[PDB]
Design a protein around this ligand. Structure first.
Ligand SMILES: COc1ccc2nc(C)c(O[C@@H]3C[C@H]4C(=O)N[C@]5(C(=O)NS(=O)(=O)C6(C)CC6)C[C@H]5/C=C\CCCCC[C@H](NC(=O)[C@@H](NC(C)=O)C(C)(C)C)C(=O)N4C3)nc2c1
Ligand SMILES: [Zn+2]
Length: 198
């Protein structure tokens, strides 16, 4: 009945992939209990840093990547959810189910990647475990792993970046292409689609 209808919680930043130095590594900034509470209130006063965030809802965890002042992620992770922020929940400024893409204004303190203009096909995928995986671009939205891995290795990394050798953003990781459970290729949202969506 109408009186009892519930509200879905916000997406919550729970950590980041640290790429600032010589070694990439995941950092957690909020535990599961505090995540649950923050999703309900939508109020997150934690300091945000970096380009690649680890994000969670009550039921899923994945990544989000700042490019040109927008924190981007996948619709299959975030749906239409707000993101928690210091002043309460923030509505998406981009939503495109056809591209599996959503975006919010980038949090204060985040740093943004620059869209790639290199035209290079030697890419790097950053996972939620801070693995930096070489990927050869094979089309507008496809790349092959130089070393295939079980899909388990990639699960939870949608919303993460594919980068060029210079560290520019080339795309947002969307889906794995698997045969017999092995990811030989990845599907990604090209940065040009983001730049157009914008
Ligand atoms: C609800 O509205 C929408 C709108 C658009 C949309 N567009 C889509 C393309 C879409 O894809 C679905 C989600 C996406 C996915 O799991 N992504 C992540 C990830 O990590 N997620 S996650 O864990 O962070 C999560 C779950 C918390 C968020 C990167 C992969 C990591 C590991 C792979 C695990 C096995 C799944 C293999 C799927 N791959 C295939 O189905 C391909 N087929 C074969 C045979 O290979 C292809 C892609 C069909 C060729 C696949 O990757 N999937 C299915 N869903 C949607 C929904
Ligand atoms: Zn580049």
């Amino acid at each position: 009945h109408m009186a009892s209808m519930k509200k879905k919680g916000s997406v919550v930043i729970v950590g980041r992939i640290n790429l600032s130095g010589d070694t990439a590594y995941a950092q957690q900034t909020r535990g599961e209990e505090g995540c649950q509470e923050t999703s309900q209130t939508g109020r997150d006063k934690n300091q945000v840093e970096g380009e690649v965030q680890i994000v969670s809802t009550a039921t899923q965890t994945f990544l989000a990547t700042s490019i040109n002042g927008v924190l981007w992620t996948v619709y299959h992770g975030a749906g239409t959810r707000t993101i928690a922020s210091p002043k309460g929940p923030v509505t998406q400024m981009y939503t495109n189910v056809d591209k599996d893409l959503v975006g919010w204004q980038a949090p204060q303190g985040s740093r943004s990647l620059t869209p790639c203009t290199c035209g290079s096909s030697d890419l790097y995928l950053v996972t939620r475990h801070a693995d930096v995986i070489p990927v050869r671009r094979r089309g507008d939205s496809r790349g092959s792993l130089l070393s295939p891995r079980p899909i388990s290795y990639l699960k939870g990394s949608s919303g993460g970046p594919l980068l060029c050798p210079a560290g520019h953003a080339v795309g947002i990781f969307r889906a794995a292409v698997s045969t017999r459970g092995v990811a030989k290729a990845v599907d990604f949202i090209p940065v040009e689609s983001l730049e157009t969506t914008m």
